[model samples]
Target chain A: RPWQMKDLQAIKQEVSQAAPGSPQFMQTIRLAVQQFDPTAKDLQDLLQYLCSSLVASLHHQQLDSLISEAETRGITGYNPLAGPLRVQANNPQQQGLRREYQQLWLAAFAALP
Target chain B: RPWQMKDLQAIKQEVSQAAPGSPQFMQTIRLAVQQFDPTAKDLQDLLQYLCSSLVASLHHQQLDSLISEAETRGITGYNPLAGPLRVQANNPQQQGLRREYQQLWLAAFAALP
Candidate 1:
C-alpha cells in the first residue's frame, strides 16, 4: 500500500479549511470543523493542536492490519466500522464521526488525483 | 418516511445556485453546477428545468420499493454500481454544482439551525 502511517496525518490537514471567504459559511464550517475536529483530529496537527491523540491512537502494526483489511473490504464512506481495537478512526467515535473522518480521507484521496 | 422521494427534488433546487455573488467562483461553480445539473435534474423542477425524468423515472412503485430498500439498506452517498442503474446526483451534469451547493446546503442546514 502506498499510503503509509505518515500519510494519514497529511490527510487530516488537507480536509480542513482556514476560514473560507463566506463568514456565515465559514462560521458553519468552522463550527463543524471544530466539532468534528475534536472527534477526528487531523493526523499531523492533531497532536500539536490538541496533543498527539491520533498518533497515540494507533500503532504502525495496526495500520498495516487495517490496510490489508481495507484492500479486501475497501475503505468506503459507507459501512465505516472498525475491527476490534486500535482502529483509530472508528475505535471511539460515533458512526457520523467516523463518516466525517472518512470524508477527510476521501478529500485526501481526491486531492491526489 | 417523512422525507419524500420528492424531497430529493428539493435538493436539486437547493444545490443549484441562481448565480452566486463570487464571479470567478460563480463562473466556475455555475459552470460546474450546470454540468452536474443535467445528469441530476431537480425533481421538483426537472420537468420545468429540462423535460422530465423525475416523474418518469420512479413510476410510484419504485418509490415505495426504494424507500423500503433505503430503510433496509440505508440511503447514503456511497456506491459505484447501482447493481442495476445509473443512480444520479452522481450523474450530476456538473460535479461543480456542488461547489455552490455547499454554499447553499450549508446555507440551509446551518442557516436554519
Candidate 2:
C-alpha cells in the first residue's frame, strides 16, 4: 500500500493538470504500464488503497456511476480479483483497458455498505 | 467554512497531543466554548465542516456507536436548529454539553445514505 501512494499521487496530479480528455488518455497509458505486475498477490490490499485514495481524492463523476452499477448487482465485500495484476493486450500500443479495471475495482469498494 | 479551518487544525493538534483521556477532557472544554456562536448561520455549513473533520480525524471508537444510535431513530438530512446555536448553561463551571451535541449532530450526518 505504501508503494502505491507515490504513483497514486502522480496520477491524481496528472488528472488535475490535464487539459481535458487528453491528459487522461496519457494517464491511462501510464497506469496500464505501472499497474501490471506478475508477482503482487492479493490485489485486495492494493485495491483498498486505490479505492481509499480515489475516495479521498473525491473523484466522483465516473466513480458514482461505477458504484451505482455495482450496487444493482449486489456486489458486496471483496471477491476474487478480475484477473492477474497485469493488463494484457495483443499490442502494447493498443487502446486503454485500465479504466475498466479501475472502475470495476473502485466499484467493488464503494459498494461495501 | 474557511474560517473554521484554522480552529479545526488547532483542535485536531490538541487532540493528537493529549495524553489519553485527560487531553480529550480539555478538548471538550475547548469545544464547548468554541462551538457556541451567536452569529454563525445554517450551522449546516459548520456542521458539515465539523463532520468532515471528525471523520477525517478518524476518531471512530466512539463515532460508530453514535452513528448506529442515530440510524435507529431514522434521523436523516438537515433539520431545524436544535436550539439557538449557542450552548445554554447556567454556570461557567458547568459540565460538558458539547460532547452530547457533537454526538447528536455527527450521528445525524453519518446516517445520511
Candidate 3:
C-alpha cells in the first residue's frame, strides 16, 4: 500500500518528539524504515532529505534573524553575502552554531542501525 | 564597508545566470569570494551553506511535485516517507536525479580556486 498522510505524520511526529542526537532519535528513523519496508536506497534518501531539510531550515532562519537585526539597526537594507555583512554572516559564532547542528545530525545518522 | 543589498543582488544574479555545473559557475563563486574578501573559514561556510541550500531546495521541490500528483490522483493525502510512496520517493529515477545534482555541486566545489 502507498503511504497515507497518517503514516508520514506519525513518522514526523515521532522523530520530532525524540531527543535530537540521542539513540532514540536514530532508533526512530530506523523503526520508521522498518515499518515502511522501503529499499536500502530509500532509507538513505529519506535520511538525506531529513538532514538537508534541517540544515536548510536553520540556515534560512539565521538569515532572517540577521535581516531583522539589520532593519532594527536603522539600516535600510543589508546584504549577507558581501562586504562586512558577509563576514558577519560567516562569523565564528554563527559558524559554531551551524557546526553544532551538523554534528548533531551526523551523530544521529551515524548511529542508525 | 558592510554588505549592501546591491552587492548581494549582484552576486545572486551573476551566479543564477551562470550555467550550472560549468567552469563559469565555479568561477563565479570564486570571484564572489574574492570580491567579498571574507576569511577562509567564512568562505568554506558559505560554500557549505550554498550546497546544502541547493540540495534542500531540490528535495522539497520533489516532495511538492509528489504531493501534487497524489492530489490529482484523488488521494486526499499522501505520505512520502512510508510504504510504497516511500519506495517511489527513493526510486532509482529520483535517486539518479538527486545524485546528478550532488555531483554537479561537488564538482564545482572541488574546482574552487
Candidate 4:
C-alpha cells in the first residue's frame, strides 16, 4: 500500500511522544519505516520528508548547532538530512546532546528495511 | 529571523485554502517564501519541506502520474521535489492538470526572493 498523509502524521505523533534521541524515539521511527515495506526510493523520500518535519520542530539554536556539527564532520553537502543540522556549538555538553540526536537519526536511517 | 513551525503551519493553511495550480495558489506560496528573506540554502530547505507536505496531500494516482511525468522529463535523479511527482498519466487532461501544478511550483521557486 502507498503511504499517505495520515501515516506520516501518525509517525510524527508517535515520534513526538518519545523523548528525542532516546532508544524509544529511534525504535518508534524505525518501526514506522519498517512497516512501509519501502523501496530505496521510498526510503529516501520518507527520510527527507521526516527530516524536514523534525527539523522544523527544533529551536533555532539547535538548528544552528546541527548545521555547525555537520560542517565540522565534513558533511558539507546539500543534504536535507545533514545541512540544517550544521550549527556552531556553544559548549561540549550541548554539542554532545546534538550528537546524540544526530546518532538517533542515523540509526533510524541505517535500520530501514 | 529563522522560520518556526508556526510559520510553516500558517503557510500550509493558506496554501490549502487556495485552489491547487491556480494563480492564487502560486501567489500565496511565492509570498510566503518571499517573507522569509531566505538565503539560497534556506530556499532549498524550504522548498523541499514544502514539497513533501504538498506531495503528501496528493492522491495516490496523482502521485503516480507525477512520477511518470518526471521520468518523461528525464528528471530521474533522486530529487525530493521531482521524484514523487513522476507518475503515469491516464489521459491528456490529467497530464495537463499535473503540468499546471508542476508549473505553479516552478513559478513559485523562480519568484523566490
Which lDDT tens digits does candidate 1 get at residues B12-88?
A: 34534532233432344344334444332232223222112333233233433543454356434434354321243
Residue pairs with backbone atoms closer than 3 Å in model 3 (clashes): none
TM-score against native, each model? 0.23, 0.24, 0.24, 0.32
Q: Write the per-residue lDDT of candidate 2 for residues A1-113, one digit (tens) a residue.
A: 12355554444443454432342323332232333421212233443443456543343444455644654464433232443213322223322333344545444334443
Residue A84, model 2, lDDT: 26
Q: Tell me the spans in candidate 3 whose CA falls farther than 4 Å from its real position.
A: A53-108, B1-113
When summed lDDT is taken over every stretch of 10 residues in candidate 1 chain A, the lowest stretch is A19-28
Q: Clashes per prediction?
A: 7, 0, 0, 19
**Models sorted by lDDT, best on top:** 4, 3, 2, 1
**How well is each residue in A20-70 modelled by candidate 1, as lDDT tens digits?**
222322222232333333334343343343224443344233444544455
Root-mean-square deviation (CA) per prediction: 15.7, 16.6, 22.6, 15.8
Runs in model 1 deviating more than 4 A are A1-113, B1-19, B22-24, B31-87, B91-113
lDDT values of the candidates? 0.35, 0.38, 0.44, 0.46
Tens-place lDDT per residue, model 4, B18-101, is 454455445445444433434334444555555565543343344345545655565423334522332322123344434444
Model 2: DockQ vs. true structure? 0.01
Candidate 2 C-alpha error for residue A33, in Å: 31
* lDDT of predicted model 4: 0.46
Per-residue accuracy of model 4 over A42-87 as CA lDDT, tens digit each? 3444444444434433533443455466556754333445223323
Better of 1 and 3 by TM-score: 3
CAPRI grade, predicted model 2: incorrect
